[model samples]
Target chain A: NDHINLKVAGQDGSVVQFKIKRHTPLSKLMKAYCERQGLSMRQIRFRFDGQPINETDTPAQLEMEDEDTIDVFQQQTGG
Target chain B: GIALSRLAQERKAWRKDHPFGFVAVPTKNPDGTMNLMNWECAIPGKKGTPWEGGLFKLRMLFKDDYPSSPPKCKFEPPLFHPNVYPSGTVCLSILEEDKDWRPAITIKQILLGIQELLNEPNIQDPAQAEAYTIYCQNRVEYEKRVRAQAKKFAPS
Candidate 1:
């Protein structure tokens, strides 16, 4: 199994890099992201290629390659 | 206040990368100063919706508790929608104080959401009686009314 490195970016221009297996769940990355930013998990929303990534989605499922970048936004609103 | 600085950042960022058909600008003061806390927004009706080709004008006033509280949004001329009050005030779930309002919803998101709302009127939470009644009793006639209203506000 090959390991891939991905970068997650925030609107505030913060960037964090990660290296994980292709089978690693996206939640795992989201967890690391929240930790590094001192934010609650629910406070952040992660998007890959303009689509929100579900916790069950693995890097392989998303066809994510090494050095791919994921955009992060704060989820707001009641609707 | 921290909220003021945040809103200022939001204004520039929104100006740089807002939706294609939407525009948000600070309102001018009587003395020619710009009030960043208050904004005037123009949302172009979404294509393929009943509001297509129309330009909806709106006023947004952010409260002192913004970032935690939603802005006060109202149509300039009291939009004829079931979700709009006669005073032009908009009744929206997200704009509710205790609702799922996070402290980070950008101005762009709210404007975009409002445009999305023109076609998909929330019948379950109708606020204006006339529009709601007409929308439920006869959808065809309701659509015609909406189209006419949209055309009335559309650019020449």
Candidate 2:
């Protein structure tokens, strides 16, 4: 089974880890991940193999290989 | 991508114009998300004020209908101010859904607006009613409390 490793970081420097099956849509994965962390999806970023994923892009087109690393982080805003 | 490109260009222009008093850096967390560090000239050594020195993290999320929809922003580590809720949510007219936030507005403008908001909070429509009350009822006490909170979070 294909799987991906996901890492998340919060604004307060909190970090978390998650795992998901391959071919999972980044948006859907992010929604579940953010809900688990009590953070808004807008606050997180999705990166695959160290490159930022444009949310506006289609996840289906960007296939993830097994053992690929995905990073999600809380995006800080305002003063 | 368009907005991000524009922000980069404006940042270069800003750096050229203001050689002193402001510093900005682009950073990424281990998770790979992007954030900008903004420092201004108001405080000593250009070290920034209790208001400025503290790291102000910014995140922008565009909706599918962006340019037509206004982006949302929230402070991390939270902030205690009339316009910022205890939860770190910011209450500003520009960010309001009903407001006319057009694509013409740039990221530089947004940062400048935030800086202005820090200096002059809007008590009339405050996110923190208690803080607003304190400021409206007693300016001296309000100043003291705000300063204390600022000192607590101000970067060394």
Candidate 3:
């Protein structure tokens, strides 16, 4: 099948699932995720396999597998 | 081959499990190839601190003799901190070959160490004159500027 299942886990321990096409850009999922959590895109980031996920990057490009998780965290600053 | 092999395994382990709010991944080339020796990283600010609510991006440049040598970690915009050099290079013992650097240290450990250093700077080992002087002379303004900088780094 061309579809895959993924999980998005927030730093707060909240988790959610989404079914998306393998070739779909993760930005689609990221947008929906921010909405579901009522957070702004600038307020959080989505990471997969320890890499920062770009809006234009597709799951296929990322070599994402079924049931893989996407970790989300709030924006942080440091010096 | 040794470096690549070890890096691949490190990447694998990082994918399987990593600390929250930290990111460590090999950079990509224009041709879509992964640059095993160069990594893009981000460390989050600690909660309940002036640094909170911002994400800082950095680079980890490793060498062929890695594990025997530590990666050079540098912040993109040269942070205003006592332990951070004016050129943006992080001045930490754990990142120094002649210092506390050890082959057993992982990327996760490095990121966490940097995070801890954000608030608790190594004042004795000052790297930048401006931040060092300001931090030592005026703790109030130092924190104010840090908080201002944190707001500037808000993701977008």
Top candidate on lDDT is 3
Pairing residues by index, what is the TM-score of model 1?
A: 0.70
Badly placed stretches (over 4 Å) of model 3 are A1-79
Docking class of 3: incorrect
Of the two candidates 2 and 3, the one with more favorable lDDT, higher being better, is 3
Interface RMSD of each: 4.3, 9.1, 7.5
Q: Any idea what lDDT model 1 has?
A: 0.82
Question: Local error of candidate 2 at B99, Å?
Answer: 2.2
Query: Scored by Cα lDDT, where does model 3 land?
Result: 0.84
True-structure RMSD, every candidate: 4.3, 18.9, 14.4
Rank candidates, TM-score, best first: 1, 3, 2
- Tell me the lDDT of model 3 at B90: 89
Worst 10 residues of 1 chain B by lDDT: B97-106
Tens digits of per-residue lDDT, candidate 1, B1-156, equal 566788888887886777797879999889997787899989898898889989989999987787778888989999888888888888776677676455665677688667767777788777788899998999999989989988998986
lDDT digits (tens) for residues B43-137 of candidate 2: 21113333544435544444444445555655665666788887766666556556524465544544545555775676767787677788789
Model 2 bad stretches (over 4 Å): A1-79, B1-55
True contacts kept of each: 0.14, 0.00, 0.00
Report clashes for each candidate as comma-separated counts: 0, 6, 3
